[PDB]
Design a protein around this ligand. Structure first.
Ligand SMILES: [Mg+2]
Ligand SMILES: [Mg+2]
Ligand SMILES: [Mg+2]
Ligand SMILES: [Mg+2]
Ligand SMILES: [Mg+2]
Ligand SMILES: [Mg+2]
Ligand SMILES: [Mg+2]
Ligand SMILES: [Mg+2]
Ligand SMILES: [Mg+2]
Ligand SMILES: [Mg+2]
Ligand SMILES: [Mg+2]
Ligand SMILES: [Mg+2]
Ligand SMILES: [Mg+2]
Ligand SMILES: [Mg+2]
Ligand SMILES: [Mg+2]
Ligand SMILES: [Mg+2]
Ligand SMILES: [Mg+2]
Ligand SMILES: [Mg+2]
Ligand SMILES: [Mg+2]
Ligand SMILES: [Mg+2]
Ligand SMILES: [Mg+2]
Ligand SMILES: [Mg+2]
Ligand SMILES: [Mg+2]
Ligand SMILES: [Mg+2]
Ligand SMILES: [Mg+2]
Ligand SMILES: [Mg+2]
Ligand SMILES: [Mg+2]
Ligand SMILES: [Mg+2]
Ligand SMILES: [Mg+2]
Ligand SMILES: [Mg+2]
Ligand SMILES: [Mg+2]
Ligand SMILES: [Mg+2]
Ligand SMILES: [Mg+2]
Ligand SMILES: [Mg+2]
Ligand SMILES: [Mg+2]
Ligand SMILES: [Mg+2]
Ligand SMILES: [Mg+2]
Ligand SMILES: [Mg+2]
Ligand SMILES: [Mg+2]
Ligand SMILES: [Mg+2]
Ligand SMILES: [Mg+2]
Ligand SMILES: [Mg+2]
Ligand SMILES: [Mg+2]
Ligand SMILES: [Mg+2]
Ligand SMILES: [Mg+2]
Ligand SMILES: [Mg+2]
Ligand SMILES: [Mg+2]
Ligand SMILES: [Mg+2]
Ligand SMILES: [Mg+2]
Ligand SMILES: [Mg+2]
Ligand SMILES: [Mg+2]
Ligand SMILES: [Mg+2]
Ligand SMILES: [Mg+2]
Ligand SMILES: [Mg+2]
Ligand SMILES: [Mg+2]
Ligand SMILES: [Mg+2]
Ligand SMILES: [Mg+2]
Ligand SMILES: [Mg+2]
Ligand SMILES: [Mg+2]
Ligand SMILES: [Mg+2]
Ligand SMILES: [Mg+2]
Ligand SMILES: [Mg+2]
Ligand SMILES: [Mg+2]
Ligand SMILES: [Mg+2]
Lengths: 185, 222, 148, 53, 156, 51
RNA sequence: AAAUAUGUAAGAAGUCCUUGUUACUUAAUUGAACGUGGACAUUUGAAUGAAGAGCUUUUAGUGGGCCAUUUUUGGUAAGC
RNA sequence: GGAAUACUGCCAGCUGGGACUGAGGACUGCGACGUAAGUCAAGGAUGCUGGCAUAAUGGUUAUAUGCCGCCCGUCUUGAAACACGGACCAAGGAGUCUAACGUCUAUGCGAGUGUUUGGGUGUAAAACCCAUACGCGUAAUGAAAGUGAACGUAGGUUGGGGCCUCGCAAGAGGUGCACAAUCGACCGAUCCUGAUGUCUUCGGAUGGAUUUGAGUAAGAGCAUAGCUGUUGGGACCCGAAAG
RNA sequence: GAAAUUGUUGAAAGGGAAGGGCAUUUGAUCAGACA
């Protein structure tokens, strides 16, 4: 026998193809594992993983978040990749030119980008254009802006938001939520 | 398109080049190993001639075999048995002696047998059961290119360049020695000497430091 | 569907995955929210501090509607102009002719001030305004016109 | 240790490298030759059993 | 269909063998096996027969003869590991033997050639056997294990 | 595919370690060491043979 | 006043120089805290190991335990 | 005085007997021997010869023989138990559906989203189409009246994949999304402060504080579906004494 | 027209239960492959 020092037959714990079942996504994966295996280029390697990512690890990148990244010093001509969908943001009043490459473009986002004379590339087109990912700027959206993570870590003095359905006063705002009713959290 | 023999040439030539360097190095060590040995022999004599006493340096390298199975072991020794990579019975590793490993051996005496290995038994360990750790994987030695590949960084580009680093506790013994997978010995062929193993060598059992008598054992187990 | 469910998988195992010691019995803790102040207090404080007892005043016959008053931030605002019309008004930022936005007609009650509209003049008709929203509005040469 | 490691580090570099300033554990001791001159081995045996009480 | 059909089939292309490295080197025989030596047949049709070793053939076999006219055994092949090689020994320097190869014994009753070969070789030997008294008797008598023989103790 | 012991398969012995040829050639594994006759002080012998 | 157990430390989140900020603090541009600028790389600071490290969510069963060496309480004692 | 021997150790000294194994399937590697051409035991068995071509070998089966082998189910610290249920066999026979939900996932669309109360239409409970509303989200905070989110490139600092630049490379610098840590700023509650003014008690600018919020700081949601989990329901299936 | 369970026929085994595991003898029975 063997004094094992570590749990046996452990799975690596990382996705390895998408759990998604879409052909096209399956094809883009085909492109990039090829590209990853044969180009020693970091970008293709990161891109391949993001493809496997489930919906929650793929938060939307907005078109305003886009415009801001372009305002980085020396970044205004880069083409931005977003392995996910791109949404529109009425709140910005002046969107730049550039080229965004992403999986989905909402109707309004595509509009706004094209209106400023930008261009909307799919990842496979992005590939042919920059097989080593030259001049690419990768953007991710906010994962912990989900509503779910509000409730993560619920406990005393954690200050983190109840799992509650109806709300307003007389919904969990008395005993243990204020000094005058028993105590506070 | 050349390469046919063309690049086969600039290779095989370059290969002959290395066997050369290995041959001269091995010729070297041999000198060193016997003049080293003889020096001590004559030291002992010269001292007796002068009415004195030649006390040799304490050994710097020991070889440890796990002699106890896997059950009912207390936690402290257990962790140490792991750090020495002795995680199954009859497997063995080399250890460089210092205060800070001396204690480790102290802590695990009931579960191991160790002693000072000779050039002979370090050699036949490596030639017969020497495997390297290469992206883990435990790869058998059997060609010098494998060592040069992973150990060449530190000088060391032959199985004998390996053996030399161990036996002489080189300045890169850590790397040299961790490169070797733990040796996996069969049970002794002779048998254990002794009727009960889990007593000290010094009390008729098998565990503890048995000094130079380690070679007789290992050789029966290798 | 039945065929994907873990009971199908438990068939042939004695206890349906409910333990031999502790069983699956009718209602061990009590039913519903029983014992919330007794053997279920640890789960109630934490996870649900604030549950028991009272705060604040009762309002008999409170009819929401009375309090209807959706908010719109400047943040958007300009969204209440159809796009085609919108660009037309952005360029030619002026008095004399500046867009009128009935935010009541958009079904908002109050304008709040979340952040920066361009320097175009706007005529903003609303029931209510946050001090700032209106400040920012004037700072582009708009006014707020109070309606109902 | 550090204040002193800064020293022999400069005091070596500004000479001609060769430093060595990690601590090392107790090494086994080396060969040596003990002499008899003035020191012949005294030969002890174990002692009988006695009571004194 | 009664059953679907696979998506993949084996190629029925039958690979070639790897280029093995096993040279057929020659069989040195144990010292005790010189020609002229008397053998005991441990097995076979002529089992227990004492018999003269003549030639080591190209297929590793031993060529022996009785001689026929002594104990009934003809010129023959015997395999070297079913033979006890005694220490008694007749000079064979007058027996030609050159003639006798593997081909000689290819199957394809008795050809006259053999009957004559048998007479020629055997006369050479008999001439020789006769020099030592009792050999011919010995050669004619079957070897046998008696009670209390310990093959691992007997010298032959 | 199949680990071949040196130690008892001359072919690979020579594959690793090319000194093996000369070692065997100059016997070396039986080197006749120098005959020197130094003798030990009587201090050594007396105390060796003491009590 | 032991042995066994036990806290902390063994550097890049480090060491040194120059001299900004403040409503704290000093008799005091004194200090305190946070800095800007400058100098020194893997013998960069003990050993051994590392089928890697870190982090998140959600959920089962369990919440009668019993035994051996050693330490040990009650009991004359116990398969207590 | 000169040897021998034992004992212990070493040899990349030679050599005999025996057992098990023969994975792999062109070539490709590292070598060895040869002056060479070649040869080889060097990245896993080939060569030669014979016997049967069948119940010979093999499978199955029954029996015999050597050794071994308590009755399952259960609850228990502990069952083969002098614990319980079970004589036998067939056929029934137990985690379900529903309302509302948590985490995770897939899919549509995205600051939105949800056609199916309804209407239109039909090859008629289907498929196809749709106006107004509504729901949930897009704002928080107070018991409440009520107020309501940019000092700044929507901040500073530190780590950060990826990218950009230099370098043959090693490295150096630039930028740095997600995420993490930390110091700030913004909105409401609390407590101070209380300007210009005033139907002299209204008004509450401004700047603050070991206080506090399920907040802001270039949105992430809505819907359908699934597994697991939650609550109520006969609620996994059979069971009281009672009312 | 199953099973429990029964009659008959055939084959077999049985010194205080029977049934079971590894292995082979013996009987019965059988597939495949040769070419
Ligand atoms: Mg939100
Ligand atoms: Mg070790
Ligand atoms: Mg032996
Ligand atoms: Mg034996
Ligand atoms: Mg023996
Ligand atoms: Mg015994
Ligand atoms: Mg062995
Ligand atoms: Mg369900
Ligand atoms: Mg189903
Ligand atoms: Mg199923
Ligand atoms: Mg299972
Ligand atoms: Mg299961
Ligand atoms: Mg089952
Ligand atoms: Mg189970
Ligand atoms: Mg369960
Ligand atoms: Mg149960
Ligand atoms: Mg219990
Ligand atoms: Mg209540
Ligand atoms: Mg908004
Ligand atoms: Mg060959
Ligand atoms: Mg031979
Ligand atoms: Mg006769
Ligand atoms: Mg400690
Ligand atoms: Mg370390
Ligand atoms: Mg290591
Ligand atoms: Mg690793
Ligand atoms: Mg749990
Ligand atoms: Mg639990
Ligand atoms: Mg309890
Ligand atoms: Mg519990
Ligand atoms: Mg124990
Ligand atoms: Mg084969
Ligand atoms: Mg094969
Ligand atoms: Mg026949
Ligand atoms: Mg047949
Ligand atoms: Mg037959
Ligand atoms: Mg029968
Ligand atoms: Mg049977
Ligand atoms: Mg038994
Ligand atoms: Mg029970
Ligand atoms: Mg009990
Ligand atoms: Mg009993
Ligand atoms: Mg009971
Ligand atoms: Mg019963
Ligand atoms: Mg049934
Ligand atoms: Mg129709
Ligand atoms: Mg109808
Ligand atoms: Mg229609
Ligand atoms: Mg209508
Ligand atoms: Mg909300
Ligand atoms: Mg309100
Ligand atoms: Mg007021
Ligand atoms: Mg700072
Ligand atoms: Mg950098
Ligand atoms: Mg920076
Ligand atoms: Mg505030
Ligand atoms: Mg408050
Ligand atoms: Mg809220
Ligand atoms: Mg329930
Ligand atoms: Mg009932
Ligand atoms: Mg009743
Ligand atoms: Mg009653
Ligand atoms: Mg009928
Ligand atoms: Mg059988």
């Amino acid at each position: 026998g063997i004094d094992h020092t570590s749990k046996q037959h452990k799975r690596s714990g990382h996705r390895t193809a998408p759990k998604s079942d879409n052909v096209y996504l399956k094809l883009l994966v085909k492109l990039y594992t090829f590209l990853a295996r044969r180009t020693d280029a970091p970008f293709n390697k990161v891109v391949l993983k993001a493809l496997f990512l489930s919906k929650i690890n793929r938060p939307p990148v907005s078109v305003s978040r886009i415009a801001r990244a372009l305002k980085q010093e020396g970044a205004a001509n880069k083409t931005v990749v977003v392995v996910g969908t791109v949404t529109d943001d009425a709140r910005i009043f002046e969107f730049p030119k550039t080229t965004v490459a992403a999986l989905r473009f909402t109707a309004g986002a595509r509009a706004k980008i094209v209106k400023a004379g930008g261009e909307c590339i799919t990842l496979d087109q992005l590939a042919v254009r920059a097989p080593k990912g030259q001049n690419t700027l990768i953007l991710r959206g906010p994962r912990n802006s989900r509503e779910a993570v509000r409730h993560f870590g619920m406990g005393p003095h954690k200050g983190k938001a109840p799992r509650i359905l109806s709300t307003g006063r007389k919904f969990e705002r008395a005993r243990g939520r204020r000094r005058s009713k028993g105590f506070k959290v | 398109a050349e390469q046919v023999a063309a690049e086969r040439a600039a290779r095989k030539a370059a290969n002959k080049e290395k066997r050369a360097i290995i041959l001269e190095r091995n010729a070297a060590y041999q000198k060193e190993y016997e003049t080293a040995e003889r020096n001590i022999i004559q030291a002992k004599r010269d001292a007796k001639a002068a009415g004195s006493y030649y006390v040799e340096a304490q050994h710097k390298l020991v070889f440890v075999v796990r002699i106890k199975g896997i059950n009912k072991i207390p936690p402290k020794p257990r962790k140490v048995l792991q750090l020495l990579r002795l995680t199954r019975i009859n497997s063995g590793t080399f250890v460089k002696v210092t205060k800070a490993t001396l204690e480790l051996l102290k802590l695990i005496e009931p579960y191991v047998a160790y002693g000072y290995p000779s050039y002979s038994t370090i050699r036949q360990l490596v030639y017969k059961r020497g495997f390297g750790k290469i992206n883990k994987q435990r790869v058998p030695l059997s060609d010098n290119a494998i060592i040069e590949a992973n150990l060449g960084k530190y000088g060391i580009l032959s199985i004998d360049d390996l053996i030399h680093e161990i036996i002489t506790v080189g300045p890169h013994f850590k790397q040299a020695n961790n490169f070797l997978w733990p040796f996996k010995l069969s049970n002794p062929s002779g048998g254990w000497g002794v009727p009960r193993k889990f007593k000290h060598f010094i009390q008729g059992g098998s565990f503890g430091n048995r000094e130079e008598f380690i070679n007789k054992l290992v050789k029966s187990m290798n | 569907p039945s065929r994907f469910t873990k009971t199908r998988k438990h068939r042939g195992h004695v206890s349906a995955g409910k333990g031999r010691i502790g069983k699956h019995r009718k209602h061990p803790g009590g039913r519903g929210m029983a014992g919330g102040q007794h053997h279920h207090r640890i789960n109630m404080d934490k996870y649900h501090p604030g549950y028991f007892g009272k705060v604040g005043m009762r309002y008999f016959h409170k009819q929401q509607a009375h309090f209807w008053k959706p908010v719109l931030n400047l943040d958007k605002l300009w969204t209440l102009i159809p796009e085609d019309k919108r660009d037309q008004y952005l360029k030619s930022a002026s008095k004399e002719t500046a867009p009128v936005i009935d935010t009541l007609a958009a079904g908002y009650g109050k304008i709040l001030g979340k952040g920066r509209i361009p320097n175009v003049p706007v005529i903003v008709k609303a029931r209510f305004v946050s001090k700032l929203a209106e400040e920012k509005i004037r700072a582009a040469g708009g006014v707020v016109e109070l309606i109902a | 240790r550090v204040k002193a490691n800064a020293a022999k580090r400069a005091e070596a570099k500004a000479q001609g490298v060769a430093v060595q300033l990690k601590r090392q554990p107790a090494q086994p001791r080396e060969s040596r030759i003990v002499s008899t001159e003035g020191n012949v081995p005294q030969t002890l045996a174990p002692v009988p059993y006695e009571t004194f009480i | 269909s009664a059953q679907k059909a696979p998506k993949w089939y084996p190629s029925e292309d039958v690979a070639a063998l790897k280029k093995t490295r096993k040279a057929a080197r020659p069989q040195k025989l144990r010292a005790s096996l010189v020609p002229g030596t008397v053998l005991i047949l441990l097995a076979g049709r002529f089992r227990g027969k004492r018999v003269v070793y003549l030639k080591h053939l190209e297929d590793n076999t031993l060529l022996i003869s009785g001689p026929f006219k002594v104990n009934g055994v003809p010129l023959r092949r015997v395999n070297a590991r079913y033979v006890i090689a005694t220490s008694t020994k007749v000079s064979v320097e007058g027996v030609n033997v050159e003639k006798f190869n593997v081909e000689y014994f290819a199957k394809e009753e008795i050809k006259a050639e053999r009957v004559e070969d048998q007479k020629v070789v055997d006369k050479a030997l008999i001439a020789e056997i006769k020099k030592t008294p009792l050999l011919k008797q010995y050669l004619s008598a079957s070897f046998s294990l008696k009670n209390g023989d310990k093959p691992h103790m007997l010298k032959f | 595919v199949l680990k071949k012991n040196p130690l008892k398969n001359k072919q690979v012995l020579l594959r690793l370690n090319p000194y093996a040829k000369v070692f065997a050639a100059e016997k070396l594994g039986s080197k006749k060491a120098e005959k020197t006759g130094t003798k030990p002080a009587a201090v050594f012998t007396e105390t060796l043979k003491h009590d």
